[PDB]
Amino acid sequence: MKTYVPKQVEPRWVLIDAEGKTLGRLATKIATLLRGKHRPDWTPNVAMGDFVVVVNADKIRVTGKKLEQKIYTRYSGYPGGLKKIPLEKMLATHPERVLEHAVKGMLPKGPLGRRLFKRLKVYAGPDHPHQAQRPEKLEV
Amino acid sequence: MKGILGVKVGMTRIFRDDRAVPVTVILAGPCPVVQRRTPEKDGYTAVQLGFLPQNPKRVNRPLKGHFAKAGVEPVRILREIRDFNPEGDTVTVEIFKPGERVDVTGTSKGRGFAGVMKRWNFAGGPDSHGAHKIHRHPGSIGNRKTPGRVYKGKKMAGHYGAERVTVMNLEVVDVIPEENLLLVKGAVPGPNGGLVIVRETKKA
Amino acid sequence: VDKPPYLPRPRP
Amino acid sequence: SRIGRLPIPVPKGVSVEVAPGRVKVKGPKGELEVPVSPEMRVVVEEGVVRVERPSDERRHKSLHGLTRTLIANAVKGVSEGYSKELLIKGIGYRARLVGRALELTVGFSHPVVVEPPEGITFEVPEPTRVRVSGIDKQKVGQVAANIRAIRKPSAYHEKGIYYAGEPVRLKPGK
Amino acid sequence: MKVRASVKRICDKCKVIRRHGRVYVICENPKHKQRQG
RNA sequence: CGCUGAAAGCAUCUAAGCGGGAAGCCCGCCCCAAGAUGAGGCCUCCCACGGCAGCCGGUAAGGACCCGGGAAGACCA
RNA sequence: CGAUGUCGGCUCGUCGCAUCCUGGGGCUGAAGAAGGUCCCAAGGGUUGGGCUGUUCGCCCAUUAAAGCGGCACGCGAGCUG
RNA sequence: AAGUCUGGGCUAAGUGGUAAAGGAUGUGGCGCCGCGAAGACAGCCAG
Numbered sequence A: 001m002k003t004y005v006p007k008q009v010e011p012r013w014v015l016i017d018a019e020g021k022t023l024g025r026l027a028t029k030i031a032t033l034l035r036g037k038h039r040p041d042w043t044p045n046v047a048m049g050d051f052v053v054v055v056n057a058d059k060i061r062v063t064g065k066k067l068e069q070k071i072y073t074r075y076s077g078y079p080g081g082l083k084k085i086p087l088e089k090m091l092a093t094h095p096e097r098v099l100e101h102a103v104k105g106m107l108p109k110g111p112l113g114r115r116l117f118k119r120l121k122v123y124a125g126p127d128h129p130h131q132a133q134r135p136e137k138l139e140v
Numbered sequence B: 001m002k003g004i005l006g007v008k009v010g011m012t013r014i015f016r017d018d019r020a021v022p023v024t025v026i027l028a029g030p031c032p033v034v035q036r037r038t039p040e041k042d043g044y045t046a047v048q049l050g051f052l053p054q055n056p057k058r059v060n061r062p063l064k065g066h067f068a069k070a071g072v073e074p075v076r077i078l079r080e081i082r083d084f085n086p087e088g089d090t091v092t093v094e095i096f097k098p099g100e101r102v103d104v105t106g107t108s109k110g111r112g113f114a115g116v117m118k119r120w121n122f123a124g125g126p127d128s129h130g131a132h133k134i135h136r137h138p139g140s141i142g143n144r145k146t147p148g149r150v151y152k153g154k155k156m157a158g159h160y161g162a163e164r165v166t167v168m169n170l171e172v173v174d175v176i177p178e179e180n181l182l183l184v185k186g187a188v189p190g191p192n193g194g195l196v197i198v199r200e201t202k203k204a
Numbered sequence C: 001v002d003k004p005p006y007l008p009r010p011r012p
Numbered sequence D: 001s002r003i004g005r006l007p008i009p010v011p012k013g014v015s016v017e018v019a020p021g022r023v024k025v026k027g028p029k030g031e032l033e034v035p036v037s038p039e040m041r042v043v044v045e046e047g048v049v050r051v052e053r054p055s056d057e058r059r060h061k062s063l064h065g066l067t068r069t070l071i072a073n074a075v076k077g078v079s080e081g082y083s084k085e086l087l088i089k090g091i092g093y094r095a096r097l098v099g100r101a102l103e104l105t106v107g108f109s110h111p112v113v114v115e116p117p118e119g120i121t122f123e124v125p126e127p128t129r130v131r132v133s134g135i136d137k138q139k140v141g142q143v144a145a146n147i148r149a150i151r152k153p154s155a156y157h158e159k160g161i162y163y164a165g166e167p168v169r170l171k172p173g174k
Numbered sequence E: 001m002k003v004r005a006s007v008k009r010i011c012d013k014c015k016v017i018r019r020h021g022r023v024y025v026i027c028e029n030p031k032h033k034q035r036q037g
Numbered sequence F: 001c002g003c004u005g006a007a008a009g010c011a012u013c014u015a016a017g018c019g020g021g022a023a024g025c026c027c028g029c030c031c032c033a034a035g036a037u038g039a040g041g042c043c044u045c046c047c048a049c050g051g052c053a054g055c056c057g058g059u060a061a062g063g064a065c066c067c068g069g070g071a072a073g074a075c076c077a
Numbered sequence G: 001c002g003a004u005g006u007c008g009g010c011u012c013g014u015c016g017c018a019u020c021c022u023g024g025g026g027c028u029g030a031a032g033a034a035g036g037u038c039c040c041a042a043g044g045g046u047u048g049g050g051c052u053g054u055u056c057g058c059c060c061a062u063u064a065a066a067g068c069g070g071c072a073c074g075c076g077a078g079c080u081g
Numbered sequence H: 001a002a003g004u005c006u007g008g009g010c011u012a013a014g015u016g017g018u019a020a021a022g023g024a025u026g027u028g029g030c031g032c033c034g035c036g037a038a039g040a041c042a043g044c045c046a047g
Ligand SMILES: [Mg+2]
Pocket: A029, A032, A038
């Protein structure tokens, strides 16, 4: 008897209201849903997780003085090309990037996890354009 | 924020108040608006301008359809002026009065594969005292094992010119509506016969 | 700072 | 040895309605809203408002007094109103009211013009005296300080813009 | 404003203030004003 | 550097809150830029062609080849 | 050690900030002007000469200033020698 | 890969996640002296 391997199944769509939630703790759960480690038939070499839609990304909450102290960083490859952007500003300019950057770092490196991050659709503000997919609201 | 397409015609100087004024002459008008970009339809605000009469024999069917939706005769060049919304269906040199101050965008003359001394004003090497085949050379391009590489953007030889250049805060010295002329004080990018764009200046 | 050269200059 | 425990006398006829995280205070001079910690309890007795702290923790003890004095000041603001006087010293130094706004002549190569913000009124009884009146305590003191800063008291001469009741302390020259 | 690692009171009028994560010393005498650093 | 203000009946720029403040920081100016594979948007043009998300073939809108050239240019573009 | 070419100059830079200048400050035995001293600040700037291989240093004439250090005492498959 | 596991407490510095003399109303906790309803301390005043 060799271990069961699932043939491709229809992917489930999920909706999460990120409002008032703690950044890092919501991140892990979404990563989990993305991996598909909540499914008894989990297999590490195929994309079989959930599609995860997140709303109210801008209304994510964070403890301590991180709003002023968390510095997101980008290096351009040029001399003196290290850009430092604090959390306050990142929410003020591209708020959906906050949940995105967090969730991304908690996904596996390489081709697969890179494509798993594509199954994450994050929006700031209560509305998402995926009513066609009819997402199942999740409490997390 | 007004604007107009045009062609650089050439330079002279004129006399104003016992003073010689170097000028570049630009044939600007007339420019028919062939499309308007709207925040509802296009997400921003601009006016697509046309310029120079075109032989309709040369205008393909995709393009012909476009010109018809605007009820405008075929034109050689299309360019947009952003955050401009003229009342009329046509833009002429009239939108500038002498004394005003403008920005001119053009295509700089191309110096092709240019050395480092012309491109980047390097000082090169000596011409005697032992200098060995390095008279127009850059010299060092780095350090040693640390960092063991070359910076991005490191000034080196390569193509130079034939690139977009915008000169700012140029005085309008005169405007001659009967000939669609614009007289601007000083130097404008590109060769005579080259296409330019004239916008109201963003300086104070 | 003048320190003693550790290599001879190369010969043909 | 304690501020927030002391009750706030509420004269007639000013209203003090309690809300979640704020209190609203109306009176003969206007309205004021006082932001108040959810942890502090604001209590309305007959002609008296009291604030009660949830425990004897260091944080709550600090919030407690602050909350009282905050609400107390809001009461006095709609009833008596607040005001600060500014005294101008120096030979050429004068002030004059140009409409609602305050013009200041205090030795620069130009005159300075101060605009009254909302709820603030400038009045110039004499040339060397200026009065800043309003229902908001902190807004008055801020506008006061701003106007003073335009030409702070010198340290060598009796020259500049002073608070009333502000001591003239100088040091010698030569 | 004296800046130093040892901030202390100089006269009896000096007052030790902790302000925004720093230990200051404020006093009526301008010479005595200190910040720790 | 302040306003208001407790803990600490006073005081305190701070513990709640709010000001002012640099050639520096962010935007703004000029240039590159959707291989931004997250490959965006608008205007316009062609169409249900034959035989057996595929294969071959004939077209459409269009494009390339070739040629005269060019303040474009090493070739290329 | 079956080779990691060794000073100084030229060229080309880039970073650090314990900041020479310019910007912002507190204290001054700060009248003013000008200084002293410390704090913040690396955005830009930081000259031409005479001596000597010199780096360094002295000197001339100016200057807002004529900063100090890292990069194999940066840089010889880039030059010099 | 396996606990967002249980119970008690501290820390608000991202301390944790490199350092010393020395400095400090940081915070919590044990003590030890004074001085006080023979009215102390703060102050709010008369002299
Ligand atoms: Mg779950």
